[PDB]
Structures are given as C-alpha cells and as structure tokens.
C-alpha cells in the first residue's frame, strides 16, 4: 500500500466554524465513476506516459457537486477504486503515485515517479485495488470561493504490454476509476442555495443546428465545415467569448448589432459616386470615446470586403405633415479595405449609386444584407481599424490547433450578393446563442479543455466528438476539409473537463 | 418595568443557532506575544462607531439597515488600541437597544452571513436561510447577538484580503402606528459592543505606522475660517440646492473621504483658476488676443497622455474669468542684469472654441492694450468675472474644443433618499462691470480636502453622520449626511441661506448608511 500517514479532516476545523453539518449516509457507500476516469493501455505506448492525473475535490462525485451549492466550505479526503480488464496471458505493470499540492507534474521520468508514495500493480490483477487520496493543506478548511491547489494522484505506464493478438485488432487493457467520500469528508456552513458563484456547473444550451445563428453576420447557420489546409491560425473580432463569459474584441450581445453602425452625417463629396462621410456612436446612443481599450465600437465588420446594405434616415425636426418627421432609405456599400474606413477614429464612408437623396446633419442607421461582389473578399484579414498612421491595438488573441492531426471546426453560412458570380460564405467559431448563454451563466472553467459530443436524437448515440477550448473555439480530429454530413436536428452535449493531452477518436 | 404599563414586550427569548467557535487560544503556538486587554474594556458595553440607525415610515421593507463586519474597529477603545498591534483573533458581543413607542408596530430580522458569501442581493426570504432571529421594534430590554469569528486559518493580519463573519439587519414590516396625532414616532436605535472573552491582540508594532487602522476625523474649523475650493475667495454662507439642480459635476474641489483627488483638483489655494505658460501668438481684432502654451503649475511640461481631463487647477465652468496676467523676461535687457516686467488685465472665455487646455492652448484677451511680448513666460492671477454673460457654473467646459470628448471626468453626485437636497458652500464673486450678484457653490472646503489627503483614513461605511454645533449655546442646530464621494445632503423643502452663527463647526457623530432618515430642518 501507499506509505501515507493519516491526515485530519473536517474535525480539525471544529472550534473555528459554527454549524456541525452532516450529509446522507448512502452517498458515503456507493462508488461513483470519476468524470475523466477511464483510460486504455495499448502495446503502442511507451514507459513514462501519464494516464490519469486526477485531483481531490467535490467535483469528482456528482452528488457532492450538487450538495456543494448549499454550503460554504469543506475539508476531507476520498477513496479511489481502480479496476482493470485483462486475462492471464498478458504482461505489463502500472504505477500509482501520490503527488503533493504545489508540486508541478510536467514530463516526469519513469524513474522519478518511484520517488513518491507509490504502488506497482500488474495488469493481470483480478480484484479492484483501493488507494487513499488525503487532504493535505496548510489551513483549517477550504472555502467554496477561494480556490487553492490540492493533492493529485497520477498513473503512469511502468512496463510495456506484452500479449499476443487475435487478428487485425490487437489486445487492449481498459481501466475504470471510481471514487467515494472518506469517513472524514464533511461540509461546513449552510447558505442559500445557488447564490454563490464558483459552484455553478458548466453546461451547453439544448439548441439544434437549425435553431442557432451566426455570430459574424446576421444570417442563419447552414452547415459545419472543417478548416482547410492553408488555414492554420485565424484571428477574428466578432463571435469571441471565453467559456467563463468574457467578451473579447468587438463582440456584443445583440444579433441585429452585427456589422451595424449608427450616427450622424457630416460630409458630402461626389468625385464619381456619392460618398457621405459619417460619424459614429455606439449601438445604444452614447458618444464613442476614441481612447477606450476596445479596438473599435462594438459591432462593426471585421473582414475585408464590400458590405452591401440599406441606410435609412429620420430627421430630427418636423418639416411637414403636422409634426411627423420625414424618412428616406436607400442602398449603400461600406468598403472595409480602403483608407476611409476608420471606425477607431470615428469615420465610416459609404457609397451610393447615383442617388443624391441623403440630407446632411441628420442621423442615420445602417442595416446590412450581404456583399456587393466577391472582389477583395478576404474573410480572414483584420482591417486597419484606424486606417493608416496607426496600427491595430488590443485585439483578441489568435487561435490555433496545437495537437498533431487536428483541424478547426467552423460554422458555415452562405451569403447574398448585389450582383456577380460566386458562392461565398462566412465561417464563425461559436454561434451567437452560445455567446449569450456563456455571458449569462458565467460558470468557471475547471480545466483548459472541455469535451463535447454531437448527438443524433432518435438513437441517442454519438456521431463525432470535439474539444471546446477556454478561448472559445472547437477542434476536431480529421484529415480532410469537407462539410460535415450530420442530421440537422442534432446538438452537442458537454461530457467532462479534460487535459491538453486527450487524443480524440478519429473522425 | 413598571413604568411601561404592560403596553410593550419586555424581553426577547430567541437565540441564533450558532456553535461555539475558538478564539485566540487556538493561535498560541504560531504567534509571537499574545498581548492582553484592560479588564474594564472587557466587561462594559460601549457604543460602536457604527452605533446609530433609525427605522422610519420612509423605509421600504427589505432594506439593509445594518451591516457589521467583524473587526477591532467595532469598539472605540479597541480602535485606539489596535493601532499598535499587528493582528487579532476572536469575536465580539453586540447589544441593540430599540425600545420604541407603545403605538408603533414593526419587526426586524438579524442574520449571520458566512465569510465568502455575497450580501449585495439578499431577498427578505433569503435572509431566513441563515441562522436568524426576529425582533420587534417595541422590546424594552436590549437584545444580544453573537459574532463568532469563523475562519480557516489561525489569526488575521491588518491586510484587507480576508472576508469575515457579518451580521445583517433587514426591515421586515412597514412600521405602522395608530396614534391619534400626526406626530413623529420614528424609532431611534443604538448599537453597543464589547469584546468576547476569547479575544486578543497579536504582536506589538510601532504605533500609528500601518494603514488600515487609521481613524476618520474631522478638523475643528469654524465657518469663518473655511475657504472656497472652486475659486480663490473665502466662504460666505451655506445654501441649499434649488429644485432645478438635482445632480452636479464640477471637477475642482473634489476628494473622497479615503483621500483620493479626482478631476483637476489639487492642494494649493493659490492655484485655483490659474495657469502658467508662454505666449506664442498675436491676433489683432478689435480686442487683442494671444495664445499661450500652458504647462503644469510646478514648472514641468504637460503631457497630454496623462490620466486627467486637463492640467490641474484650470477653471471648470463656462464663463469669462477676469484676472491679471504678468510677464517677467527670461533674458536681461538692463539694470544690472535685472529683467523688466509688465502686468495688465486679462479675460479668459471658456465657452468658446479657443479654450482647449487639454490640447495645450489657452487663448486670452486684453482690451485695447497691445503691450505684451512674445516668447516670454506668463502667469495668470484670477480676480473674478467681467460680466454675467454666458455664466453657468454647472456646465463642464470642453477641454479639447469641439469635435472631441471629455475623458477621465469625476462622477456626478446626487441625493437618493426621499425628501433630501444638496447643501452647498456659497461665495459671492466680484464683477468688473454690469449688474449682477453671482455666486459659486462648492461641495467641500479646501481645508477639508487637504485634511482628507493628509490623513488617508479608510471609510467604514458610505455615509457619515455629522451635526452643526453652536459653541456659545451648546446646542445642535441641524444635522447632515457626509457622503463618501465628497458631498453633503440635508433634509429640507426650500432653497434658502441656512442662517447659522459663523463660529460654528461640524462634529462627526457616527457612521450610517443610505437609508438613514435625517431630522427635518
Ligand atoms: Zn453627392
Ligand atoms: Zn494686438
């Protein structure tokens, strides 16, 4: 067994806390499977590969993770149970170590894991083994708000697997990890339920692909499309929101505010076409301070191109008709690649085909429809938000799939044109409804990667799986670039929090 | 007992369901000294600095009337003792006296909230999910509450990064009354504290060195000794806000009670409505106009990328400020190498497009006296206003002209309790010519700004309760609310000069919150 002395639990925290609470005795007996508690050992693995990397806390047991939203703190350890699935005609060994709180586990040697409290178990063992996970700390108990590191338990391949195969498929030992609370685990102080943050679990909304919408243009979603070979690292400015609910770049919450602006008209020129320089405010009606940390006012376009839309004008003063002001609305185009599109400075220029009906010094409102033509349409180039004479500052960071053999997963939506030839599309990372749900919930991220699975509703089985990152993008494990053929009435389901080393099943 | 005729409840028989929590004896093997406290302070109830609060018919049910964090600053003897120690561990004992009239009817609820729980959005039924006790406002004998110091470490330090066990009061009924007369039956309540037997200090340090333990004090200065903080004159009288003015924004004379200067405020009395620079231009209209590249008031170049709306000390209202500009030559033309000097009248219009002091330019004027050198240093000394044309003191000028926005402004301030208006300090300004009697109202005197900057004491609440004391009579005239943003409000219905003796002063009474009903003037 692991050489560990007994560590105190919540009875140490008795004279500094006020309520003496208990829980259900049936939860203290049943062994519940850990959320990331499964791994398989293969003949392809090498010694020194980490397999579990578990950690102490109430997030292992989904009964304690539901009871934790009623209390103020906790203290105590757990009991781990490891099962294997092998037979007598095999060979190979595994090791299970006990790692302290502030010790960094980063690419350890197979020799160096024997310098911990460890057990070495063969892969032939018939009975499930029991390991202790104690609560080492330097205080009396843990708070549900202030998070601090805890004791981990780490599995590692010690000796490679030797067996003889059956056919075109090789033998494989599958392992499961189940936990239950120790007799000294306890909670501390009853509060109102579901009031404190930091205990709210991360979820996804149950909305199918036909009911969601794009986050970079106000068009519905058409299909899912994996990223091409020459696209490896994108950087957009709309549809950016982390899983904790922090809006980055020029991302806002309303669907209608995407590629939309509002303000007054100041200038008029007519070299060939009508120009109409326009000063802009925010989308609520406040004067835009140009020294804000944002790159631009929220909801301006974020790609090069010629956005075709309708601009309407409603004048302030009542000219006629018994005090009802006049209206006008025409087509226009905003080009985003020129040196006139400077929304950080506060000027956006439009273009109207031979229609001189737009009165100056009366406020307007732009409503986008589609593109003018496919000329200068690059959907992965950030425009110069200040024109020349200044560089782009304080953007969202670039995102990229770092795992070998993984591509980005986009949401494709086709687009109308004014005239010409082409079938263009705008790809986004997350839908707008996911952005709104992440902003309203604001649940914390326990890890850096989350695991989701696409669900077909009539069978209830998974079609593929992807990795949802903290920065707000998804990656799949595929080797081609093609639209994903799935039923349209499907959705994603959140499964667990994983590491950066989880290998997806090939798509 | 016998004086009340059985008309009121005599005692409350209800406890909070809390466990005995350890104190400073748990912390003994890891601390240094474990100092002790005088036994008279241990056994006598003394009024807390959060002592006073009232229940009124203006209060809605569900308002937080009291929010006491645990600390040594809950006792006025321990708050003086705690300025020479390093830490503490242990609880307190709180006593609430709320013996109201026999005709009223209302109830209060007191609950115990854990350390890391949010208290900002409690409903009246969420407060019953804690260990609570319900007390009506007619009980004769005072009630006793615990405050047991729940923590997850051995003791505390004087740092501000550990939340502590709180007590929270809430109004639970509407405070009705069935007296026959239309007379004020507003209940006055008091809070009295003393330390628990399991309370101790930790480690002797130099006294009054650390922050986080300095107490808030007011200076004893009469109204005849105060000075205006928006214009370099003396304060004449106090004057309530009119019914048209509901919120103000004036970047000079602004300082929080914690000791933070906001807007373009500074400390020097002579630097209000004054600047300093170099003449760079000459404009020959009917009047003579000049352009001045202004610097800071100490003699350093003004960087426009600073986090301020303007250089500190510029005028902060629309009008035409009248003063005297003077020149002293950087070179020596004559007289044993002594420089020559010129000094003439001036006028600074601040509502036009030529008053952009954030960009660096302030344009002045002199009438029919074009005797002013170029590329020589200047200084402006304000006297008053030349005419009341375009004079509005509650509009902030554009510090970068037209086609730009004001940045890093101080926030606007307004009263929120019903029936209350603002209380100003009014001084009357001289004019050059015309008919008028203008006035500039400030939120705070300049001496209070300097005192709050020198003390830098923390605030234990949002509002402080002060009273105006007449020292020859020994009787209080009125009371007011001093807010943490740096402004005072009174409870009145008119707009008139407050007629008081000019040798009276304000006296700091207690810390209150924003639901305190002031007495009507
Ligand atoms: Zn034109
Ligand atoms: Zn001249």
Automatic annotation (TrEMBL), chain A:
<feature type="binding site">
    <location>
        <position position="274"/>
    </location>
    <ligand>
        <name>Zn(2+) 2</name>
    </ligand>
</feature>
<dbReference type="Pfam" id="PF00915">
    <property type="entry name" value="Calici_coat"/>
</dbReference>
<dbReference type="InterPro" id="IPR029053">
    <property type="entry name" value="Viral_coat"/>
</dbReference>
<feature type="binding site">
    <location>
        <position position="268"/>
    </location>
    <ligand>
        <name>Zn(2+) 2</name>
    </ligand>
</feature>
<dbReference type="InterPro" id="IPR013643">
    <property type="entry name" value="Calicivirus_coat_C"/>
</dbReference>
<feature type="binding site">
    <location>
        <position position="268"/>
    </location>
    <ligand>
        <name>Zn(2+) 1</name>
    </ligand>
</feature>
<feature type="domain" description="Calicivirus coat protein C-terminal">
    <location>
        <begin position="280"/>
        <end position="507"/>
    </location>
</feature>
<keyword id="KW-1035">Host cytoplasm</keyword>
<protein>
    <submittedName>
        <fullName>Viral protein 1</fullName>
    </submittedName>
</protein>
<keyword id="KW-0946">Virion</keyword>
<dbReference type="Pfam" id="PF08435">
    <property type="entry name" value="Calici_coat_C"/>
</dbReference>
<dbReference type="GO" id="GO:0030430">
    <property type="term" value="C:host cell cytoplasm"/>
</dbReference>
<keyword id="KW-0862">Zinc</keyword>
<feature type="binding site">
    <location>
        <position position="270"/>
    </location>
    <ligand>
        <name>Zn(2+) 1</name>
    </ligand>
</feature>
<feature type="binding site">
    <location>
        <position position="274"/>
    </location>
    <ligand>
        <name>Zn(2+) 1</name>
    </ligand>
</feature>
<dbReference type="InterPro" id="IPR004005">
    <property type="entry name" value="Calicivirus_coat"/>
</dbReference>
<feature type="domain" description="Calicivirus coat protein">
    <location>
        <begin position="1"/>
        <end position="255"/>
    </location>
</feature>
<dbReference type="GO" id="GO:0044423">
    <property type="term" value="C:virion component"/>
</dbReference>
<dbReference type="InterPro" id="IPR033703">
    <property type="entry name" value="Rhv-like"/>
</dbReference>
<keyword id="KW-0479">Metal-binding</keyword>
């Amino acid at each position: 067994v692991m050489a560990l002395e007994p560590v105190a639990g919540a009875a140490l925290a008795a004279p500094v806390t006020g309520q003496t609470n208990i829980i259900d005795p049936w939860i203290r007996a049943n062994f519940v499977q850990a959320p990331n508690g499964e791994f398989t050992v293969s003949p392809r693995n090498a010694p020194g590969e980490v397999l579990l990397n578990l950690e102490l806390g109430p997030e292992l047991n989904p009964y304690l993770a539901h009871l934790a939203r009623m209390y103020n703190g906790y203290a105590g350890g757990m009991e781990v149970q490891v099962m294997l699935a092998g037979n007598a005609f095999t060979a190979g060994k595994l090791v299970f170590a006990a790692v302290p709180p502030h010790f960094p586990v980063e690419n350890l040697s197979p020799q160096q894991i024997t310098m911990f409290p460890h057990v070495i178990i063969d892969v032939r063992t018939l009975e499930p083994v029991l390991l202790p996970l104690p609560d080492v700390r330097n205080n009396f108990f843990h708070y549900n708000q202030k998070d601090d590191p805890k004791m981990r338990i780490v599995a590692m391949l010690y000796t490679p697997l030797r067996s003889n195969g059956s056919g075109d498929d090789v033998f494989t030992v599958s392992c499961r990890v189940l936990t239950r609370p120790s007799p000294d685990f306890d909670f501390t102080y009853l509060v109102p339920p579901t009031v404190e943050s930091k205990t709210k679990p991360f979820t996804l909304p149950i909305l199918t692909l036909g009911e969601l919408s794009n986050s970079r243009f106000p068009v519905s979603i058409d299909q899912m499309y994996t990223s091409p070979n020459e696209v490896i690292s994108v950087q957009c400015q709309n549809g950016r929101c982390t899983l904790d609910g922090e809006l980055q770049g020029t991302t806002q919450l309303q669907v209608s505010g995407i590629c939309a602006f509002k303000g007054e008209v100041t200038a008029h020129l007519q070299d060939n076409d009508h120009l109409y320089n326009i000063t802009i405010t925010n989308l609520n009606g406040s004067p835009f301070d140009p020294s804000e940390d944002i790159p631009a006012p929220l909801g301006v376009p974020d790609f090069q191109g010629r956005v075709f839309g309708v601009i309407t004008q409603r004048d302030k003063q009542n000219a006629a008709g018994q005090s009802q002001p006049a209206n006008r609305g025409h087509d226009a185009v905003v080009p985003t690649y020129t040196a006139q599109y400077t929304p950080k400075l506060g000027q956006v220029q439009i273009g109207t085909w031979q229609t001189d009906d737009l009165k100056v010094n009366q406020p307007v409102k732009f409503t986008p429809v589609g593109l003018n033509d496919t000329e200068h349409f690059n959907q992965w180039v950030v425009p110069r938000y200040a024109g020349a004479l200044n560089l782009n500052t304080n953007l969202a960071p670039s995102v990229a799939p770092v795992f070998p053999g993984e591509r980005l997963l986009f949401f494709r939506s086709y687009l109308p044109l004014k005239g010409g030839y082409g079938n263009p599309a705008i790809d986004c990372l997350l839908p707008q409804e996911w952005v709104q749900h992440f902003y309203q919930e604001a649940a914390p991220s326990m890890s850096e990667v989350a695991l989701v699975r696409y669900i077909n509703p009539d069978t209830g089985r998974a079609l593929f799986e992807a990795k949802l990152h903290r920065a707000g993008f998804m990656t799949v494990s595929s080797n081609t670039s093609a639209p994903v053929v799935v039923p349209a009435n499907g959705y994603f389901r959140f499964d667990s929090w994983v590491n950066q080393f989880y290998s997806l099943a090939p798509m």
